[PDB]
Amino acid sequence: FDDNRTAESTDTNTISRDKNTSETVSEKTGTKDNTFDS
């Protein structure tokens, strides 16, 4: 959540709002095999 309020005087008041929401999901699987012979 972020809000900003700007105003100037010598009267052109400016107000802004914005919504940032995000989610990420990730599933990682692996498999490693090895054989040795001495």
Binding site: V25, K28, N34, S38
Partner: protein, 55 residues
């Protein structure tokens, strides 16, 4: 006569000895060693990862 008579009076046995030893020992040792190693390796792998995002 004299003192020596006492030696005969009481049976006296004088015993001596002497052992003189010598010994030399000589040892020679030789050794050889031979080794041989042979190895093999092999590894394989697989991965999967799926990421889904919403904003």
């Amino acid at each position: 006569y004299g003192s020596d008579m006492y030696k005969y009076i009481e049976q006296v046995t004088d015993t001596q000895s002497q052992d003189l030893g010598k010994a030399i020992e000589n040892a020679i040792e030789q050794g050889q060693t031979k080794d041989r190693q042979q190895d093999k390796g092999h590894e394989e792998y697989k991965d999967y990862e799926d990421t889904i995002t919403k904003s």
